[PDB]
RNA sequence: CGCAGAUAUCAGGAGGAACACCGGUGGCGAAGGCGGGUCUCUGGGCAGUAACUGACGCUGAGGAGCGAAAGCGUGGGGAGCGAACAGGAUUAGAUACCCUGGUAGUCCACGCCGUAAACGGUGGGUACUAGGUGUGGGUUUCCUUCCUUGGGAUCCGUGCCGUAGCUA
């Protein structure tokens, strides 16, 4: 499968108590794909470079993955479509 | 009513100067322009317009109740300093200079070019 | 694109050997390969002219290549073919 | 004891100068990443806008990559871009 | 244009084109041309090893295909700019420069035409022919720290100066 590496920022009003479980109620659907390498980072509340909707701070987060084309595709248009993520971003951890 | 400290906007040009006091919301309590102080036309980019524009809107802020501002600046101007100068002539206290002019990232196409 | 696994594929069906790349059989073969996925390709994407270009370089060379073993020996010519399914 | 020129003294050096620099692969450095922002925000002026070669020292590869880095960490508000 | 409450200023939202600082005698593309970011699909070139076939090469009338912009058609969309066009002002007169406004168009999809100073005003392929100098990419050995426009040699591409030679 091919590496990528996710970044997500959410609001604050979320708790680091809700933080991975919620996420793993994605990635279940990756799991059940390729028994694939999934590795979070939790490094949140963190103040922004500028607001969005007005929310001075965000919970980042990093996710490290080892999975096929249609499933990051899919998974993004799962989150994207969610209420609660502000944004999302792809990045193949490989050469190109 | 009134307000001890606020927030100033200058906006100078090449055919024209004017400035704003305001409270750091957004809310104007007095301005003033070279329109107003008398000149006309092709005069009013020299900066002794600026002095008496900002001259005259500071002693309306004094009037209002204001002894300290912020200011702002913004757009060509060959006499910002010298509308600085007569602000702080006027009896007013310089909080904090930023020079915003607004640039674009390559936005918007700008008309084309004169002779 | 051709990964090693589906070259070494070809060249044990079509490579005289297992060494062999010059062999012109296995040539045109992967460039017979190549042209069938990169049509594939320009099924959706009608407008990727600098890829139609590439297209158009390996006909060429494979045409030529099949010039030069007609020139040969017409046996391995018509083996080859009938063998790929082209129709020259 | 020795001149910025004229090092007949010692091997070729493994250091660097005002016209050369590789400041990357110099010193300054964990990867090229845009989570680490403290150290993107080197290569920088207070204003938010980006140096040049020939005021850092680095080749294009690196030059390039870390403006990737940059400008993806811009968009994902990891960096105070230059604003209102 | 306002004096029916403008310009300015601030909070928010709607909206469609172009994507500063990187970025320039710098990279890619056969040519045209090509940069907001991320993913997918795909192509080309370079170097080294030089394992494989063993002259299969170069060119190319005719012919096919691509091909800046403006234009044309069906449809969509339309913030700014702006042919035409209206007015103002200069003017001897101004169907023009300047100012105010502003339609087609610029934008997207699918097709067309198929031209330009489409310029290095130098067709392509190849061998030898003094050098120096910057520069982009990849190999490699020595002072070797071996964290280096390291330095040297080599290969590819790219610019400046300059011998013989050549040219009205």
Not at chain 1, 43 to 65: F, M, P, Q, T
Not at chain 3, 1 to 6: D, H, R
Request: hydrophobic letters at 35%; charged letters at 30%; aromatic letters at 4%.
């Amino acid at each position: 499968m091919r590496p990528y590496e996710i970044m997500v920022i959410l609001d604050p009003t979320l708790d680091e108590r809700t933080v991975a479980p919620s996420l793993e109620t994605f990635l279940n659907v990756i799991r059940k794909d390729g028994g694939t390498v999934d590795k979070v980072d939790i490094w949140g509340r963190r103040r922004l470079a500028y607001e969005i909707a007005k929310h001075a701070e965000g919970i980042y987060a990093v996710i490290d993955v080892k999975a096929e084309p249609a499933t990051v595709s899919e998974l993004d248009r799962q989150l994207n479509l969610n209420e609660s993520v502000l944004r999302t971003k792809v990045l193949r951890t490989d050469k190109h | 009513k009134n307000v001890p400290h606020g927030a100033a906007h200058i906006k100078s040009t090449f055919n024209n100067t004017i400035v704003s006091i305001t409270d750091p919301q957004g809310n104007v309590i007095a301005w003033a322009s070279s329109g107003h102080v008398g000149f006309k036309g092709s005069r009013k980019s020299t900066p002794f317009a600026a002095q008496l524009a900002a001259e005259n809107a500071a002693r309306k802020a004094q009037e209002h109740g204001v002894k300290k501002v912020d200011v702002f600046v913004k757009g060509p101007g060959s006499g910002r300093e010298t509308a600085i100068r007569s602000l702080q002539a006027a009896g007013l206290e310089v909080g904090t200079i930023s020079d915003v002019t607004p640039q674009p990232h390559n936005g918007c196409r700008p008309p084309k070019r004169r002779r | 694109a051709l990964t090693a696994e589906q070259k070494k594929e070809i060249l044990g069906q079509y490579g005289l050997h297992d060494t062999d790349t010059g062999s012109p059989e296995a040539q045109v073969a992967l460039l017979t390969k190549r042209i069938q996925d990169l049509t594939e390709h320009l099924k959706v994407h009608k407008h990727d002219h600098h890829s139609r270009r590439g297209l158009l370089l390996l006909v060429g060379r494979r045409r030529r290549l099949l010039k030069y073993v007609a020139q040969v020996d017409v046996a391995r010519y018509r083996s080859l073919i009938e063998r790929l399914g082209l129709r020259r | 004891m020795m001149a910025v020129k004229k090092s007949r003294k010692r091997t070729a050096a493994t250091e660097l100068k005002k016209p050369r620099r590789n400041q990357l692969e110099a010193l300054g450095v964990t990867t090229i990443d845009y989570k680490d922002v403290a150290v993107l925000r080197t290569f920088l002026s207070e204003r938010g806008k980006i140096r040049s070669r020939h005021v850092t020292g680095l080749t294009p590869q690196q030059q390039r990559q870390v403006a990737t880095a940059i400008k993806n960490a811009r968009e994902m508000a990891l960096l105070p871009m230059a604003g209102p």
